[PDB]
Design an enzyme around this catalytic site. Structure first.
Site, short mmCIF file in Angstrom:
data_model
loop_
_atom_site.label_atom_id
_atom_site.label_comp_id
_atom_site.label_asym_id
_atom_site.label_seq_id
_atom_site.Cartn_x
_atom_site.Cartn_y
_atom_site.Cartn_z
CD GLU A 132 41.88 48.38 46.50
OE1 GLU A 132 40.92 49.14 46.76
OE2 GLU A 132 41.73 47.17 46.26
CG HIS A 210 42.24 40.56 42.49
ND1 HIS A 210 42.02 39.38 43.17
CD2 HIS A 210 42.52 41.49 43.43
CE1 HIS A 210 42.16 39.59 44.46
NE2 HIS A 210 42.46 40.86 44.65
#
Ligand SMILES: O[C@@H]1[C@@H](O)[C@H](O[C@@H]2CO[C@@H](O[C@@H]3CO[C@@H](O)[C@H](O)[C@H]3O)[C@H](O)[C@H]2O)OC[C@H]1O
Ligand SMILES: O[C@@H]1[C@@H](O)[C@H](O[C@@H]2CO[C@H](O)[C@H](O)[C@H]2O)OC[C@H]1O
Ligand SMILES: O[C@@H]1[C@@H](O)[C@H](O)OC[C@H]1O
Length: 302
Positions: A132, A210
Site C-alpha cells: 500500500e 477487498h
C-alpha cells in the site's frame, strides 16, 4: 473440509494456486479450519506473523515464533507461501517511523528485509515487498519511507530483496485496484512501467481485492489494466467480498482464470468468524466452518 478442492480445480487450469491465510491461532482453534486448509487450498499467507511489528518489535531484535510456525505448517503440508509484508506504513513499530536520517532508515530497511527474507530463503514463493504505497489518486503515499528516503526506497527494497532471495517472486501489493480506469490503478500501472524501465526487479503486482457486494464484475478489467504495467505476473492477494455471493465470487475467479498473467488467488481467511471483516460474512466458509454456496459455485465454475 469440502470434498472438492477448488485449489485442485484451479490448478487444473494451469494456475499456480488458490490459497488462503493462517497463523497459529486459526490453524489450531478447532479441527475444521486446518483440515479445510490442507484439503481445499494450496497456498498460505501469514495473516500477521511476518509484519514488521511482529518480526522486529525493537531495532535489530527479531521475534520469529509466529512466522516460523506458519512457515513450518505450510512447508509440512505442501502449501506454497507468500511472505507478507516487508515494507508497510501500517503495523510498523514506532522506532522505525521516528527515524529522520535517510542513511539510518535505509540501513534499517535493508537489515529488516535481509533478516526476515534470509530466515526463509528458498521457502517463499512470493514476497509482498511493498504494501500500500499509493494514495487513491495514484500518487505515492507519504509514509516514513517515502518522506525520509524519497521514491528511491522502492528501488532499494526490491534490489535488496532480489539479492537476498533470488528464488522469490518480488511483489508490490495494494488495495482498490478493482476497476479499470480507477486513479489508483492508473497510478500503479504508470509507476511500475517506469520502475521496470529503470531496472527495478518487480516480478508481480498484487491486487488485494477487498470488495463490497456487486463489485466482482469489474475485477476482470482491473486485472487487464494491471497487466499493462509489464510485470511477469499479477495475483489477487487478499480476496473477500461482503455478502460472499456466488455471482461476485465466480466473477472474481473468472477474472483471474481468463487473464494469462494472474497466477493465483488468495482468499483473506477461511471461515467468516475469523474474518477481519466478520460482520459482512465475506468468506467461503461459514460460522460452522462449512462450505457456503459461493465455494460450490466456484468449484462448479472450474
Ligand atoms: O493486534 C494485532 C491485530 O490488531 C492485527 O489485526 C490484523 C490487521 O491486518 C489484517 O490484515 C491486513 C488487512 O488489510 C491489508 O492492508 C493487509 O495487507 C493485511 O495484512 C488482519 O486480517 C487482522 O487480523 O493483527 C493481529 C495482531 O497482532
Ligand atoms: O488495510 C487498510 C485497508 O483495509 C484500508 O482500505 C480498506 C481496504 O478494505 C476495506 O475493507 C475497505 O474496503 C477499504 O477502505 O486502507 C488502509 C489500510 O491500512
Ligand atoms: O525454523 C526456521 C525455518 O522456518 C527457516 O526456514 O530456517 C531457519 C529456522 O530456524
Amino acid at each position: 473440509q469440502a470434498s472438492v478442492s477448488i485449489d485442485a480445480k484451479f490448478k487444473a487450469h494451469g494456475k499456480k494456486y488458490l490459497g488462503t491465510i493462517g497463523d497459529q491461532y486459526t490453524l489450531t482453534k478447532n479441527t475444521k479450519n486446518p483440515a479445510i486448509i490442507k484439503a481445499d487450498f494450496g497456498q498460505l499467507t501469514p495473516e500477521n506473523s511476518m509484519k514488521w511489528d511482529a518480526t522486529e518489535p525493537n531495532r535489530g531484535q527479531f521475534t520469529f515464533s509466529g512466522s516460523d510456525y506458519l512457515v513450518n505448517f505450510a512447508q509440512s503440508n505442501g502449501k506454497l507461501i507468500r511472505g507478507h509484508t516487508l515494507v508497510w506504513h501500517s503495523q510498523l513499530p514506532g522506532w522505525v517511523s521516528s527515524i529522520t536520517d535517510k542513511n539510518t532508515l535505509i540501513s534499517v530497511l535493508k537489515n529488516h528485509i535481509t533478516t526476515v527474507m534470509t530466515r526463509y530463503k528458498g521457502k517463499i514463493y512470493a514476497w509482498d515487498v511493498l504494501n500500500e504505497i499509493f494514495n487513491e489518486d495514484g500518487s505515492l503515499r507519504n509514509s516514513v519511507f517515502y518522506n525520509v528516503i524519497g521514491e528511491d526506497y522502492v528501488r532499494i527494497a526490491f534490489e535488496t530483496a532480489r539479492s537476498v532471495d533470488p528464488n522469490a517472486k518480488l511483489y508490490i501489493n495494494d488495495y482498490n485496484l478493482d476497476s479499470a480506469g480507477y486513479s489508483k490503478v492508473n497510478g500503479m500501472v504508470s509507476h511500475v512501467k517506469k520502475w521496470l524501465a529503470a531496472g527495478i526487479p518487480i516480478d508481480g503486482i498484487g491486487s488485494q481485492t477487498h470488495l463490497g457486494a456487486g463489485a466482482g464484475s469489474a475485477v476482470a478489467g482491473a486485472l487487464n489494466a494491471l497487466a499493462s504495467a509489464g510485470t511477469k505476473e499479477i495475483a489477487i492477494t487478499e480476496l473477500d467480498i461482503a455478502g460472499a455471493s456466488s455471482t461476485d465470487y465466480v466473477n472474481v475467479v473468472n477474472a483471474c482464470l481468463n487473464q494469462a498473467k494472474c497466477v493465483g488467488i488468495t482468499v483473506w481467511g477461511v471461515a467468516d468468524p475469523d474474518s477481519w471483516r466478520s460482520s459482512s460474512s465475506p468468506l467461503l466458509f461459514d460460522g460452522n466452518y462449512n462450505p457456503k454456496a459461493a465455494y460450490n459455485a466456484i468449484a462448479n465454475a472450474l
